[PDB]
Amino acid sequence: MVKKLFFILSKEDKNFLFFLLVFSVFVSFIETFAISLVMPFITLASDFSYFDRNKYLISLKEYLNIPVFEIIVYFGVGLIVFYVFRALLNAYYFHLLARFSKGRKHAIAYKVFSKFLNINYEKFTQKNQSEILKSITGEVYNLSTMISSFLLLMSEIFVVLLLYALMLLINYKITLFLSIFMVLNAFILVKILSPIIKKAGLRREEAMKNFFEILNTNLNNFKFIKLKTKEDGVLSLFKAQSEAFSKANITNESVAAVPRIYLEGIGFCVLVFIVVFLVLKNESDISGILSTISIFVLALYRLMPSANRIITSYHDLLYYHSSLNIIYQNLRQEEENLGEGKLSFNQELKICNLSFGYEGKKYLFKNLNLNIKKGEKIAFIGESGCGKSTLVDLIIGLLKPKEGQILIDKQELNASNAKNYRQKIGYIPQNIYLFNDSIAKNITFGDAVDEEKLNKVIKQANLEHFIKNLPQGVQTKVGDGGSNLSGGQKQRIAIARALYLEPEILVLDQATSALDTQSEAKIMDEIYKISKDKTMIIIAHRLSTITQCDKVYRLEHGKLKEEK
Amino acid sequence: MVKKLFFILSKEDKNFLFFLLVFSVFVSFIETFAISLVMPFITLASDFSYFDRNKYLISLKEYLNIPVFEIIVYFGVGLIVFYVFRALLNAYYFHLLARFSKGRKHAIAYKVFSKFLNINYEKFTQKNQSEILKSITGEVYNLSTMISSFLLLMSEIFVVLLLYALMLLINYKITLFLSIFMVLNAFILVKILSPIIKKAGLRREEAMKNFFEILNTNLNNFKFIKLKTKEDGVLSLFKAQSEAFSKANITNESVAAVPRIYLEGIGFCVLVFIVVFLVLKNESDISGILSTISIFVLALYRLMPSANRIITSYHDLLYYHSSLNIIYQNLRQEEENLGEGKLSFNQELKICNLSFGYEGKKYLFKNLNLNIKKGEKIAFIGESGCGKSTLVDLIIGLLKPKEGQILIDKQELNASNAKNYRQKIGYIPQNIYLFNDSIAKNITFGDAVDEEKLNKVIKQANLEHFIKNLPQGVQTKVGDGGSNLSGGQKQRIAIARALYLEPEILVLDQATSALDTQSEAKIMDEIYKISKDKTMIIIAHRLSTITQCDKVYRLEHGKLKEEK
């Protein structure tokens, strides 16, 4: 269970979080060397005796150094300097807890999250977005506040063993009491209150997952649920998650408080009964139980949190940790920074012996071959998602062939020159999930504000007649989905976001002119004269727009053939 | 600032959280009536004197009730019964804190979140989804754990005033000390450590917002960012948020620990000055500072949390609270449960004098009139969003007219019979945000597993030839939006999710046959013979599919006219 922790925190985090245990264990010696001087400076204060008594204090007052006045000044100064050094120490030794916690929360989580970008786009498109986003958030904060209390458990147990090595080793009666009354409540809680708490924590984790994913599942299609506008759908579905997260979070945060209450109870009690046993021959009182009780109460309060944080973090480590590190070996070991190489598309692009499929799956290409010289302007009139959306995307640079090759000018561009060709093609998705911004955003997307490129693309895009019509112009709001940036605008901004990287493969990969019909007529002056410089791919199961193509591979069952 | 709190918690929560203050203030009298007996039972224990001395104990031992043996048994029993009643009370009086906190977290938040479903779909579509989802989550947990410590501040101040009303009212010297040393650190913290902490909290809130929204902004278009596959984009953008949330969360959680450290510091220091000032002839001492110091330390620890929780919750209440309750008066007061009425579409549907726009805004219709008998099968070659999506939607059942009326069989269906007509039309969005499920989900969506309806629709939908081709069939996993649930699959499932509510207005509101071209040829046997029973609306800026329509209102600048 603790493997994934030293497996998530790299050498940097390991070194700096291994020294932290030393800091907390060594500062417990300060909070037991400056805090266990209280009795001495309260018992040497009334009366001014003590130094004319006992072997130690009489062999110390016989050091003839001084009297009993300047010693109080010196001791008060060393105690306020010990307290001031204790606090000056506590600043950085409690302000590093947030560096470890919120650090990994907002360093590790980010690194591993965007680490899921080196993966093949297949499985990245074979897992719900709700699942991905719900994970990269609450689990991060949870395991962050769960890691930063699982290293305060050993410091307090070592400080308790170190408090017992002097006040119970020593002391003998307090030895038996600190080895019987600190282990008699160690099984009363960590066996009876542990399991049910763990189960509550797991139930809470599943509840959180379910909730997040469901709500985001009602989020993407805000419309059909407002088509019926069902308070049925809305209230009931959201109340599944509402009441679930309610009962779960509440039960968790309540059972989490059971520990400290039971610790206090056992403390004041296990005082009472043992006090009631021996009441017929005393006939003396003394101390010895004072310091013992104060120390065992302090230690009990310092291991109660160890217990609770254990119960909850044992439910939080099973959640992420594995699911966040294991999907980082089939996804980062993938198309990561080319492969120290690149290629050129001066000749043709041949497919040759395709044969691919999904992660299930059933093959659909099965030894398929085709070629296209750099400028052929091909088209694929087939089955879409069983033809178009699949074969054309496979033809891009993503989705490794299950038996193919694909050669750009006779160079074998497999998982090698991948990055050096991925950044060498267009897109234009017509139904593009544009993000709220200002017209020019995205447009250039990840380029820049090249103006000379911005304006030129804007005029190239047959959209200058609605951009000049805009209110703020190139900085005109877009909203998001709709958001006038629909087909007409959306797809203009799409061919434009596709002209922003320029060369050299203009795949349709969407809709033959998004929506409008004069668009295969008005963006043909962009699709057939402007775009007369390169190699264009077409996802047209329609007509018209392929009035300037050359190869029309019809993918029947179960192979392609450029009918033309 | 505390207005929105009694404005968020309804009468139920108000009554049950008003009694909580009484419970915590009255149990402080128990934790000061059972905890302040310690001295008495430790000072009457050594020696067995005391009762043969002092007016009180000698007038109490002269009660002749008993001796000094059975009294210890009785007192130990009442102390273990007071402690046991203290704990038995602490159970429910610490397990209601999670009921108030996690309750409103997972009751109030849900209620108000889905409360945003009664709103007009206009502004619900004029605000980013990232903004909506990032709010309905972290802000909920934050204000939940922020509310459940803002009511523990008055109980500890009232218990401190009640501890001072007996140990400092009384005591006189401890009166002056409890009115000077509890107010001298009350401005050292709540003026110097308050402001910067508040600013850190707000900075952290903004950071959290920015981060969440940004990451969700890279989430929706996982493709173009994998088109360039930019570790530039990925790492840099995500690192803005990473380092931001890092510094913010860490600074917040560190400065949040400043209070208790400074409280301890001031405590031991002040004690040191009180022990170092008067030290020129002592020789002899007493108590009076023991109980005083213990009590002021306990109270200081119990108001330190008051201070910190104040500093953070003052930054968390400004976040939600307002933004979560104020958008519940223009959004719930809206189309909420019809208006005790309904209507019938036995005659025609007239528009008459549209003239609508938005909240911006520049009108688009400008006095527009048109009518359509129930079965006309109309089409709008406008431009969508501004004509199709607009007119179709507006006259659909959403987006209140800015000057119109719309009559279904002469009945004025404004904001009244709305719900009784919203649940009386189709949809089919072609590019439908399909969830991750099993073919039949959604299909029926919010209906049921009507089988006789399920199978019948499935065969009606011209998709039986790919459903029978599926692996798990009607329970075939839909990937995401495909995967395999492609254009044909999506739009088949769309016309099908539209046939699931059946009658009576079959709007296109998307794509003239989504993608495929034999689809206006193969789903015409669904669009022109099956769908020969009702009134169909068409969002076709294309051709073909409107080979069976009757009115083709072309919306030029700036009005419509059924050219036909």
- Would you say B478 and B507 are in contact if contact means Cβ atoms under 8 Å apart? no
* Tokens 């803005």, residue located: B240
Same domain, B178 and B228: yes
CA of B207, closest CA in chain A: separation in Å? 12
Q: Rounded distance, CA A79 to CA A87, Å?
A: 12
The single-letter code of the amino acid at B352 is C
Q: Rounded distance, CA A216 to CA B113, Å?
A: 12
CA of B150, closest CA in chain A: separation in Å? 17
Which of left, alpha, beta for A141 (phi over 0: left; psi -120 to 50: alpha)?
A: alpha
Burial string for A525-547 (b: 16+ CB within 10 Å, else e) reads: ebbbeebeebbbbbbbbbeebbe
Q: Where are the alpha helices (DSSP H) in A256-351?
A: 258-277, 290-316, 322-325
Q: What is the CA radius of gyration of chain A?
A: 36
Same domain, B329 and B445: no
Look at strands A407-408 and A348-350 and give their pairing: antiparallel
CATH number at residue A348: 3.40.50.300
Same domain, B79 and B215: yes
Task: Kindly tell me the burial class for residue B173, based on how many C-beta atoms sit within 10 Å of its own C-beta (0-12, 13-18, 19 or more).
Answer: exposed
**B505, containing H or E segment:** strand B505-507
Same domain, A138 and A34: yes
Which of left, alpha, beta for B363 (phi over 0: left; psi -120 to 50: alpha)?
A: beta
CA of B53, closest CA in chain A: separation in Å? 19
Domain ranges, residue A388: 339-564
Q: What is the dihedral of CA B447, B450, B453, B459, to 10 degrees?
A: 100
Please, which residues bridge with residue A553 across strands? A562
- Would you say B506 and B498 are in contact if contact means Cβ atoms under 8 Å apart? yes
- Would you say A506 and A477 are in contact if contact means Cβ atoms under 8 Å apart? no
Write down which residue in A338, A360, A393 finishes a domain.
A338
Q: Is the preceding peptide bond at B438 cis, omega within 30 degrees of 0?
A: no
| Residue B449 forms contact with A (CB below 8 Å) | no
Partner-chain contact B228 A446, CB within 8 Å: yes
Per DSSP, the residues of A138-204 read: HHHHHHHHHHTTSSSHHHHHHHHHHHHHHHSSSSSHHHHHHHHSSSSSTTTSTTTTTHHHHHHHHHH
* Chain B residues touching residue A129 (CB < 8 angstroms): 219-220, 222, 480
Q: Rounded distance, CA B293 to CA B472, Å?
A: 73
Q: Which of A38, A46, A117 to mutate to test the interface with B (most CBs of B within 10 A)?
A: A117
The beta strands (E) that lie in B53-157 are given as none
Residue partners of A313: CB distance under 8 A and separation at least 6? A143, A146, A147, A149, A150
Considering only CB atoms, A239 lies closest to which of B110, B251, B488, namely: B110
Residue partners of A163: CB distance under 8 A and separation at least 6? A32, A295, A299
The single-letter code of the amino acid at A18 is F
Q: Rounded distance, CA A495 to CA A493, Å?
A: 6
Look at strands B407-408 and B411-412 and give their pairing: antiparallel
**Annotated binding residue B387:** yes
Per DSSP, the residues of A427-441 read: ---SS----SSBSST
Half-sphere exposure of A243 (CA within 13 A, CB side): 5
Q: Rounded distance, CA A383 to CA B465, Å?
A: 13
Same domain, B172 and B63: yes
**Annotated binding residue A267:** no
| Residue A18 forms contact with B (CB below 8 Å) | no
- Would you say A430 and A487 are in contact if contact means Cβ atoms under 8 Å apart? yes
Q: Give contacts of A 88-117 with B, CB under 8 A.
A: 90-91, 94-95, 97-99, 101-103, 105-107, 109-111, 113-114, 117
Q: Rounded distance, CA B541 to CA A491, Å?
A: 14
Task: Kindly tell me the burial class for residue B234, based on how many C-beta atoms sit within 10 Å of its own C-beta (0-12, 13-18, 19 or more).
Answer: buried
Considering only CB atoms, A107 lies closest to which of B246, B423, B486, namely: B246
Which of left, alpha, beta for A7 (phi over 0: left; psi -120 to 50: alpha)?
A: alpha
Reading the block at residue A126, the tokens are 């074979």
Look at strands A411-412 and A407-408 and give their pairing: antiparallel
Residue of B nearest to A242 (CA): B106
Q: How many domains does chain A have?
A: 2
**Annotated binding residue A382:** yes
CA distances from A108 to A8, A98, A151 (A): 8, 14, 18
Same domain, B561 and B503: yes
Please, which residues bridge with residue A372 across strands? A349
Same domain, B209 and B348: no
* Chain B residues touching residue A434 (CB < 8 angstroms): 221
Same domain, B398 and B484: yes
- Would you say A374 and A159 are in contact if contact means Cβ atoms under 8 Å apart? no
CA distances from B32 to B166, B266, B287 (A): 11, 24, 19
Q: Rounded distance, CA B106 to CA A246, Å?
A: 5
Write down which residue in B309, B338, B367 finishes a domain.
B338
Size of the A and B interface in Cβ pairs below 8 Å: 356
Same domain, B265 and B353: no
Q: What kind of experiment solved this structure? A: X-ray
Reading the block at residue A246, the tokens are 């309610």
Q: Rounded distance, CA B434 to CA B428, Å?
A: 12
Burial string for A485-518 (b: 16+ CB within 10 Å, else e) reads: bbbbbbbbbbbbbbbbbeebbbbbbbbbbbbbbe
CA dihedral sign of residues A153, A155, A161, A167: negative
Please, which residues bridge with residue B506 across strands? B536
The single-letter code of the amino acid at A227 is L
Residue partners of A214: CB distance under 8 A and separation at least 6? A130, A237, A238, A240, A241
Same domain, B110 and B227: yes
**B372, containing H or E segment:** strand B371-373
CA distances from B462 to A549, B493, B496, B524, B547 (A): 31, 10, 9, 10, 19
Q: Rounded distance, CA A413 to CA A415, Å?
A: 7
Q: Rounded distance, CA B142 to CA B207, Å?
A: 14
Considering only CB atoms, B245 lies closest to which of A106, A251, A431, namely: A106
Look at strands B407-408 and B348-350 and give their pairing: antiparallel
Same domain, A311 and A359: no
Please, which residues bridge with residue B348 across strands? B373
Q: Rounded distance, CA A401 to CA A398, Å?
A: 9
**B529, containing H or E segment:** none
Write down which residue in A338, A373, A405 finishes a domain.
A338
CA angle B211, A136, A134 (to 5 degrees): 100
CA distances from B98 to A254, A341, A465, B143, B256 (A): 6, 58, 59, 13, 22
* Chain A residues touching residue B216 (CB < 8 angstroms): 133
Instruction: Return the axis-axis angle of helices B11-30 and B70-92, rounded to nearest 10°.
Output: 160
First vs last C-alpha separation in chain B: 61
Rounded to 5 degrees, what are φ and ψ at A450? -75, 0
Q: Rounded distance, CA A360 to CA A357, Å?
A: 8
Reading the block at residue B112, the tokens are 């108000």
Q: What is the CA radius of gyration of chain B?
A: 36
Three-state secondary structure call for residue B137? coil
| Residue B265 forms contact with A (CB below 8 Å) | yes
- Would you say B376 and B551 are in contact if contact means Cβ atoms under 8 Å apart? yes
CA distances from B384 to A489, B381, B389, B392, B406 (A): 11, 8, 5, 9, 20
What number of residues does chain A have? 564
- Going by the DSSP 8-state scheme, the letter that residue B433 receives in this structure is -
Q: Rounded distance, CA A528 to CA B326, Å?
A: 53
- Going by the DSSP 8-state scheme, the letter that residue A357 receives in this structure is -
CA distances from B253 to A143, A266, B249, B366 (A): 16, 32, 6, 56
Residue partners of A272: CB distance under 8 A and separation at least 6? B76, B79, B80, B83
Q: Rounded distance, CA A502 to CA A424, Å?
A: 8
Give which of A418, A409, A447, A254 is closest to A336, Cα–Cα.
Answer: A418
Q: Rounded distance, CA B35 to CA B38, Å?
A: 6
Per DSSP, the residues of A48-73 read: S-STTSSHHHHHHGGG-S--SSHHHH
Rounded to 5 degrees, what are φ and ψ at A13? -65, -35
Same domain, A285 and A353: no
- Would you say A150 and A309 are in contact if contact means Cβ atoms under 8 Å apart? yes
* Tokens 């993407």, residue located: A220
Three-state secondary structure call for residue B553? strand
